[PDB]
Amino acid sequence: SGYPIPTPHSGQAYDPFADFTAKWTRANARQIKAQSHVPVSPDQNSLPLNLTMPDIPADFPQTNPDVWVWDTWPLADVHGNQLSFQGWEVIFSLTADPHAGYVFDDRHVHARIGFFYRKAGIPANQRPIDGGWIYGGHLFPDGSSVKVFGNVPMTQNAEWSGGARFVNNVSLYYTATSFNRNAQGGNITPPIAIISRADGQIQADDKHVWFTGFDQHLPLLAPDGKYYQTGQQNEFFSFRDPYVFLDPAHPGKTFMVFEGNTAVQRGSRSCTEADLGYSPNDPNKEDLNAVMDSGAIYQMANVGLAVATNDELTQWKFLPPILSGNCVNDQTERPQIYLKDGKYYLFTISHRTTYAAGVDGPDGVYGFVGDGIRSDFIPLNGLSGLTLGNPTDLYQPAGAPYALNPNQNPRTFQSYSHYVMPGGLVESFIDAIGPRRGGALAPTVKININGTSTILDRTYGNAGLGGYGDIPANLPA
Ligand SMILES: [Mg+2]
Ligand SMILES: [Mg+2]
């Protein structure tokens, strides 16, 4: 075997205030490829079937014909219960315009937060194929989001993901972004990313849902340069996707996970033996200098933690990160803390194309398990971290969603932004399927979480495929 021993992990809980960061190591990450098989043409899937998202039909419906929809989150509480209001289900999505001239892959800097609603508890025979979502439109008033950036030079602004907390009964945590780009789309000045809070009121009658408020935006967090990488340290830094939750182990407190980057100057040779995570005599180890020479120093993802410094939840303090992937992958996005069986699962999304040199894995969801919000997190499924990937041959090149390589599974980029719901249901959006780009919700799927491993449930729905955009409420608010 050419694949190394994975770095062991205890699941041990630390104090949330402790400077301890669990490492998603190269030796961990390399288990994905190790666990895989060389696909058997006509087979274009290397992944264990248990870790594969089933194939989404190319005839998928739009969520709305007039809107591009991608990152989505439900109406929820700090317990991650999904909430209906007066018999209505409510979701929030990043939205953009398909006919405004810009292509799907440049949608990001034009993103606005919209909402959709529909009646809860409708059976499949009465739900339309597109999930029956009614477009509510833009959640925030024009210009409310961009106020945070005062007078700075900018060539666009956008609203990026977070979460909705019913508590003005509704708090929308999200990422305000500002960009200053030239002709070629190079940064004149480093992008600005600020985790913000806007409060408003959901209202409904028998015929619709609507909101008021969200007029006054509260800036909460931007990178410090000590735990989380600033624009000045790295023009291509990431800082976004707040998930706000209560840890029952820590009442009187409210916490937040979010995507960050390790705070170093871009190009620093700052990876250690810890990030590689080999045993000394493992024949399949790697040399640190060899790894840093490959350019893996440009891949320095982390998941951060913050805690409310008041009851108002209007003031937040940074804690040390709870997970790094230094020299493994530059993106750990939309992190969430999922409570099951008295355990803590950290789920986070990542891209095949953001892996460091010498490491490889699919687009989809990665999971880690521990005894606390800050653990020596155990990477799920063979100490790999992969929970659920798009069907992918890791023995062939990635391609891109705008340029599909026909040596590669045409559904390698079929879904992204996997969000884990109560009972292990997973919602996501469709990126590329063959020539077609989605901007629409994927079929909901279901994973059975079983201690250190997970299984895609193929008895769920249509051989694992539930309804398009099936994001259901558990609880009335
Ligand atoms: Mg308008
Ligand atoms: Mg690669």
Side-chain angles (χ1 to χ4, degrees):
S1 202
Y3 298 108
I5 301 338
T7 318
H9 295 281
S10 58
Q12 63 210 332
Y14 290 80
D15 198 306
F17 292 76
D19 195 311
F20 177 86
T21 301
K23 289 119 170 65
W24 186 30
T25 57
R26 288 184 62 98
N28 293 134
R30 280 177 71 200
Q31 302 318 307
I32 302 165
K33 183 82 183 271
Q35 274 173 264
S36 293
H37 67 277
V38 165
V40 194
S41 320
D43 176 7
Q44 279 181 314
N45 186 30
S46 73
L47 299 181
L49 180 59
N50 286 69
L51 307 174
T52 308
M53 208 178 158
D55 272 30
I56 303 174
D59 77 11
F60 63 88
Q62 290 314 285
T63 308
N64 180 291
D66 307 342
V67 195
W68 276 335
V69 178
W70 66 109
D71 286 4
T72 302
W73 62 93
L75 190 58
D77 57 20
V78 295
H79 309 280
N81 304 132
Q82 286 172 199
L83 310 175
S84 65
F85 189 88
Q86 289 302 279
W88 302 97
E89 267 160 23
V90 179
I91 63 185
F92 316 86
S93 308
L94 303 188
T95 70
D97 187 354
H99 322 286
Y102 53 83
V103 297
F104 190 66
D105 297 289
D106 301 344
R107 67 197 182 279
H108 299 103
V109 296
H110 301 256
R112 270 296 272 281
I113 293 157
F115 75 101
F116 301 76
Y117 62 97
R118 72 182 185 180
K119 302 274 195 182
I122 308 291
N125 53 111
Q126 285 289 329
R127 278 267 188 252
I129 186 90
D130 66 10
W133 287 111
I134 306 143
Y135 182 32
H138 301 336
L139 180 62
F140 306 142
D142 290 347
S144 71
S145 181
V146 60
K147 260 164 218 204
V148 308
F149 307 115
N151 246 85
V152 299
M154 76 190 88
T155 64
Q156 268 116 328
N157 72 306
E159 303 163 355
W160 279 4
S161 309
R165 302 301 186 253
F166 184 99
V167 290
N168 286 337
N169 49 21
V170 170
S171 282
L172 213 303
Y173 302 82
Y174 74 107
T175 318
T177 57
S178 189
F179 305 88
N180 193 210
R181 276 156 184 190
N182 57 47
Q184 257 282 308
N187 300 296
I188 290 170
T189 44
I192 311 180
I194 306 169
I195 288 170
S196 306
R197 172 178 161 169
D199 291 349
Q201 192 157 105
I202 188 170
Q203 282 124 19
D205 55 45
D206 48 317
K207 297 299 174 173
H208 59 150
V209 168
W210 66 97
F211 292 85
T212 57
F214 303 130
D215 295 286
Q216 293 282 96
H217 288 231
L218 202 24
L220 306 171
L221 294 172
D224 55 333
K226 273 143 215 212
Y227 301 130
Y228 311 99
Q229 207 180 31
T230 75
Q232 279 68 54
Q233 284 160 351
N234 178 20
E235 60 168 327
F236 312 110
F237 85 106
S238 296
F239 192 77
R240 37 159 192 279
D241 309 342
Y243 177 92
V244 162
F245 66 104
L246 209 82
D247 181 3
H250 292 285
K253 335 293 218 156
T254 313
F255 282 101
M256 184 197 291
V257 293
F258 57 90
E259 173 183 15
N261 275 151
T262 297
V264 287
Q265 173 52 38
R266 178 172 188 71
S268 283
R269 288 173 59 93
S270 57
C271 287
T272 69
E273 302 303 332
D275 307 312
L276 271 63
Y278 295 106
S279 319
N281 281 359
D282 185 356
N284 286 321
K285 68 210 223 183
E286 295 165 286
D287 172 271
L288 177 58
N289 279 310
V291 172
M292 289 193 294
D293 290 350
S294 65
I297 53 148
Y298 293 121
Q299 284 75 46
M300 289 223 177
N302 75 7
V303 181
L305 192 72
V307 59
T309 18
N310 78 0
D311 268 21
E312 318 166 41
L313 302 189
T314 45
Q315 5 280 176
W316 290 84
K317 66 197 216 192
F318 275 134
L319 298 175
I322 65 158
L323 189 77
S324 60
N326 295 341
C327 274
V328 178
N329 201 303
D330 198 48
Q331 324 268 263
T332 53
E333 329 197 73
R334 298 191 71 191
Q336 54 186 124
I337 301 290
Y338 194 79
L339 301 182
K340 180 183 203 298
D341 271 7
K343 304 297 183 202
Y344 296 77
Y345 292 81
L346 170 55
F347 298 109
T348 180
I349 65 175
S350 185
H351 295 275
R352 167 153 202 198
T353 64
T354 60
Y355 274 108
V359 166
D360 214 346
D363 290 14
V365 44
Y366 291 85
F368 310 78
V369 62
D371 300 341
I373 60 179
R374 180 186 306 281
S375 301
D376 193 20
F377 275 107
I378 304 153
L380 293 188
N381 290 308
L383 286 166
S384 73
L386 178 62
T387 297
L388 195 68
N390 291 321
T392 307
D393 180 24
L394 292 169
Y395 288 98
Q396 286 288 275
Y402 47 76
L404 287 178
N405 184 319
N407 288 144
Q408 181 58 240
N409 196 304
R411 281 157 175 91
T412 198
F413 300 124
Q414 86 179 350
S415 74
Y416 196 59
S417 218
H418 294 76
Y419 182 83
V420 182
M421 310 195 291
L425 302 191
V426 180
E427 59 85 351
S428 63
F429 79 89
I430 298 173
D431 182 1
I433 295 175
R436 196 174 167 204
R437 302 301 288 283
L441 296 164
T444 297
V445 297
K446 181 171 166 291
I447 58 168
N448 297 345
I449 305 165
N450 312 326
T452 52
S453 51
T454 72
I455 308 176
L456 187 282
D457 189 4
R458 274 178 200 276
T459 79
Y460 186 70
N462 174 4
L465 297 186
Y468 289 94
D470 200 7
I471 304 176
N474 331 291
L475 255 179

